[PDB]
């Protein structure tokens, strides 16, 4: 699926929050129009194309841009650069979670701007109230933002479902660090298993009743809340009170 709509392509490039001293890594470059717009704004673009024939034609198509390099390789086995950078990608359906993990694990990444299936982006950004476990776990380190829906008819060939632009931003200052962050991650893990039936019952496996009740109230969360509908700001408040 190749995005052809010029307005959406420009929206992606502007979403990436690029600047002249920041390099970009790109995956799923397709026709390379987006690559041109990224190269206009960033220090340089390194664009990954796994297919050797497509890599060669893309390299020639973009040879009028000296700050574009095309790498004939699988992006998923690429190492991130040891300097701040941004990722931009149009991600096929079957490797979306793996690309997200690639970005979450790159310690110098600033932003990751991705075109994904619509439902994937909504879950990972809580756009309709339901929250991914990974989003909650990484919220102290990353912002997850839903940018916009992208209608199927803007691609070629036209797919079956709609897409979306979503963005990760690595926070300049993490909301938690060190052992406190680990204690937060342990709390989130504990609650997403569902042991005991409800979030209150799960928390009671690790924390005293008096403190659990105080923490739920502090966070504005009911003892029987559906775990997936607790918001990240509520998880932080819950941990704040529990960790005293």
Swiss-Prot record:
Single GO cellular component term: cytosol
Enzyme Commission (EC) number: 2.1.1.184
Keywords: Antibiotic resistance, Methyltransferase, RNA-binding, S-adenosyl-L-methionine, Transferase
EC main group: transferase
Biological process terms in GO annotation: response to antibiotic
GO molecular function: 23S rRNA (adenine(2085)-N(6))-dimethyltransferase activity; RNA binding; rRNA (adenine-N6,N6-)-dimethyltransferase activity
Domain of life, source organism: Bacteria
Catalytic reaction(s) noted: adenosine(2085) in 23S rRNA + 2 S-adenosyl-L-methionine = N(6)-dimethyladenosine(2085) in 23S rRNA + 2 S-adenosyl-L-homocysteine + 2 H(+)
Keyword Oxidoreductase annotated: no
Residue numbers binding S-adenosyl-L-methionine: 1, 3, 28, 49, 74, 90
Role of this protein: This protein produces a dimethylation of the adenine residue at position 2085 in 23S rRNA, resulting in reduced affinity between ribosomes and macrolide-lincosamide-streptogramin B antibiotics.
Family to which the UniProt record says this protein belongs: Belongs to the class I-like SAM-binding methyltransferase superfamily. rRNA adenine N(6)-methyltransferase family.
Protein name: rRNA adenine N-6-methyltransferase
Species name: Saccharopolyspora erythraea (strain ATCC 11635 / DSM 40517 / JCM 4748 / NBRC 13426 / NCIMB 8594 / NRRL 2338)
Annotated gene: ermE
Full-protein residues shown: 42 to 285 of 381
């Amino acid at each position: 699926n190749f995005l052809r709509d010029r307005k959406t392509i420009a929206r992606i490039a502007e979403t990436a929050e690029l600047r002249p001293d920041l390099p970009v890594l790109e995956a799923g470059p397709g026709e390379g129009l987006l690559t041109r717009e990224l190269a206009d704004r960033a220090r340089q673009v390194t664009s990954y194309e796994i297919d050797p024939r497509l890599a060669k034609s893309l390299r020639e198509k973009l040879s009028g841009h000296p700050n574009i390099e095309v790498v004939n390789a699988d992006f998923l086995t690429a190492e991130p650069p040891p300097e701040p950078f941004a990722f931009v990608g149009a991600i096929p359906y079957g490797i979306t979670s793996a690309i997200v993990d690639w970005c979450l694990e790159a310690p110098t990444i600033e932003t990751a701007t991705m075109v994904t299936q619509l439902e994937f982006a909504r879950k990972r950004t809580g756009d309709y109230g339901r929250w991914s476990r990974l989003t909650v776990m990484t919220w102290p380190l990353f912002e997850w933002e839903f940018v916009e829906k992208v209608d199927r008819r803007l691609f070629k060939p036209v797919p079956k479902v709609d897409s979306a632009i979503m963005r990760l931003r690595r926070r300049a200052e993490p909301l938690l660090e060190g052992a406190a962050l680990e204690r937060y991650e342990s709390m989130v893990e504990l609650c997403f298993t569902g042991v005991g039936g409800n979030i209150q019952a799960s928390l009671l496996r690790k924390y005293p009743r008096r403190r659990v009740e105080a923490a739920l109230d502090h966070a504005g969360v009911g003892g029987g809340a559906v775990v997936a509908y607790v918001r990240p700001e509520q998880w932080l408040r819950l941990f704040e009170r529990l960790d005293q």
